[PDB]
């Protein structure tokens, strides 16, 4: 199938924040591909990295890399190392990414030509896809996305186009996808944490019937971290859902460790420093504990990173999760429950309790793969009539 159907996408919006001060170049990112393999992600969303004199159309060149990020040969070296490790590279081409308006305020035709020419240039350079954010600020965005998708997909079927929106409205999303029907789109459709399990259920099912169960993306934002919208108690629950919904789950760097930009005083909400160990944030040593880092969470089976790796492994290998056949049945007020299946492979049952109270819930007995909370027998069959969920608990079960 398509490569972006086979696992999660990983957005690295800031190279210097992801790696450390001064090491924010393409050559340095080569040394993090092993870690990204451990997350079992199938594609990186990189950049933007092009020359962009802020709010100046004439002095913005989508075909030239800002020297602060490396050279074109550094980029080619990064592409080959990622290809040798089965990781694909998506290049973000949002033109005025250093200004307040991402698409400038003038010369819509010149800006669109810059993007169109950048598509053809970087496709010849060997990139696997592109991302364009802040689509709502682009006049006739639906038409431009159609022209850009045709060019990207006419070069090769294995090339992807990702559009991003701040919108959470369904008609505004459906009209952007109209002339495309193949565009992977990210939005704030699920951004509201306060929604109950019944409402999240309604959001997912209503979107899939309005889109005719077409392949889509699943995420809480077009660029932001999960902690920008969710409290800590809901992080594990939402990671179970995003990895088990029909489509491509898209995350931002740090989501795997529950990175919280507010936890680091002064850090930008958009590009916080990635916490590898206790030396990652030397500004305020007391602000970072070991349980907040990649090094510390990698030693903890109960950590959010260990759950991310387990769910990502299941998403990229089980055929029921790789293909988009999905049915969610009514099962309670604060419950979101659904089954995932494909032909005759192993089927998966997902039960999500969004509420603060224990709520009650196909074979009679199924084997529990994991839970978002400790204290259960993983690898010992449970039953789906006396199923009882603790607050904010999510269950993933197996049955043939």
């Amino acid at each position: 199938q398509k490569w972006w159907h086979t696992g999660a996408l990983y957005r690295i919006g800031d190279l210097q924040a992801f790696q450390g001060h001064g090491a924010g170049n393409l050559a340095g990112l080569k040394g993090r591909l092993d870690y990204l393999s451990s997350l079992k992600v199938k594609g990186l969303v990189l950049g933007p990295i092009h020359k962009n004199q802020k709010d100046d159309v004439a002095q913005t060149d989508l075909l030239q890399i800002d020297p602060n990020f490396g050279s074109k040969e550094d980029f080619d070296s990064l592409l080959q190392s990622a290809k040798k490790k089965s990781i694909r590279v998506i290049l973000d081409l949002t033109p005025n990414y250093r200004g307040e308006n991402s698409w400038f305020s003038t010369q819509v035709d010149t800006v669109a030509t810059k993007v169109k020419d950048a598509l053809e240039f970087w496709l010849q350079a060997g990139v696997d896809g592109f991302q364009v954010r802040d689509i709502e600020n682009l006049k006739d965005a639906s038409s431009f996305l159609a022209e850009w998708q045709n060019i990207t997909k006419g070069f090769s079927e294995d090339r992807l186009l990702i559009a991003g929106t701040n919108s959470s409205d369904l008609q505004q999303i459906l009209s952007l996808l109209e002339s495309n029907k193949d565009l992977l789109l990210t939005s704030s459709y699920l951004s509201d944490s306060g929604s109950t399990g019944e409402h999240t259920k309604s959001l997912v099912t209503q979107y899939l019937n309005a889109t005719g169960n077409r392949w889509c993306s699943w995420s809480l934002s077009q660029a932001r971290l999960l902690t920008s919208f969710l409290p800590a108690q809901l992080l594990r629950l939402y990671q179970l859902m995003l990895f088990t919904l029909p489509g491509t789950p898209v995350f931002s760097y740090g989501d795997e460790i529950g990175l919280d930009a507010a936890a680091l005083p002064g850090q930008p909400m958009e590009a916080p420093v990635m916490l590898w160990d206790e030396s990652s944030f030397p500004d305020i040593p007391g602000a970072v504990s070991a349980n907040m880092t990649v090094k510390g969470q990698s030693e903890d089976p109960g950590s959010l990173l260990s759950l991310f790796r387990r769910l990502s492994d299941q998403r990229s290998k089980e055929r029921s999760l790789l293909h988009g056949d999905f049915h969610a049945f009514s099962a309670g007020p604060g419950l979101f429950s659904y089954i995932r299946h494909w032909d005759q492979n192993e089927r998966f049952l997902v039960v999500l309790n969004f509420g603060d109270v224990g709520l009650s819930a196909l074979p009679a007995k199924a084997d529990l793969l994991l839970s978002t909370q400790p204290g259960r027998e993983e690898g010992s069959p449970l039953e789906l009539e006396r199923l009882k969920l603790e607050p904010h608990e999510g269950l993933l079960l197996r049955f043939p």
Partner: antibody
Amino acid sequence: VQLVQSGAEVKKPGASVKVSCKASGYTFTSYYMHWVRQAPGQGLEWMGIINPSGGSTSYAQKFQGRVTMTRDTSTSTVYMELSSLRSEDTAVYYCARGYYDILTGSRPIFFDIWGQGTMVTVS
Amino acid sequence: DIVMTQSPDSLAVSLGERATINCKSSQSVLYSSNNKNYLAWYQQKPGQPPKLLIYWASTRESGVPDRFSGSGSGTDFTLTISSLQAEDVAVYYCQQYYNTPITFGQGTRLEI
């Protein structure tokens, strides 16, 4: 290279006060801006931090809910606003620039450039 | 939150004599990663903002006379003045920046 704050202000209980802090002589968006207040004859108390490149803030819990820090990059000015003023808020309010370690690219929170100060008196 | 305690609260020392101010923190401010102590010393004269004297517990800011020196590690720190001079009458504060919130000492007054 200096920081110049607005003039002294007198306010009634329950009112709000907004102190400005204009920067000059350096790249404004590269240095974090902190606020420290000092009651007459008392010690120093750190209020919070604003980063001019993005506007993200972080306030001490003692002031969470009453303090708001904003920035204007065009005028290179930082604003601090305190609401629900009481008698304990009578103090001199300083804006201070956060140190930048050129060697390590880190910003440890000690203050090399201070503002003149602004006396706020509450009835 | 880290509490800073200075000692003494007031200090009288004649001219050209050794002045010693101590600062204790309820929690070690020694960062094991870079082996640095996140402590600073300030000097404040009446009607003026505090002025940064020492940081990293013992590194002196450029422009501060050689007589000022900072020492200590972990939880105990000392600001020492070799030979007291006339323009040194001020209140001296220590400040930790190991963690947030940033906290100061209560301050030591230095008179002749």
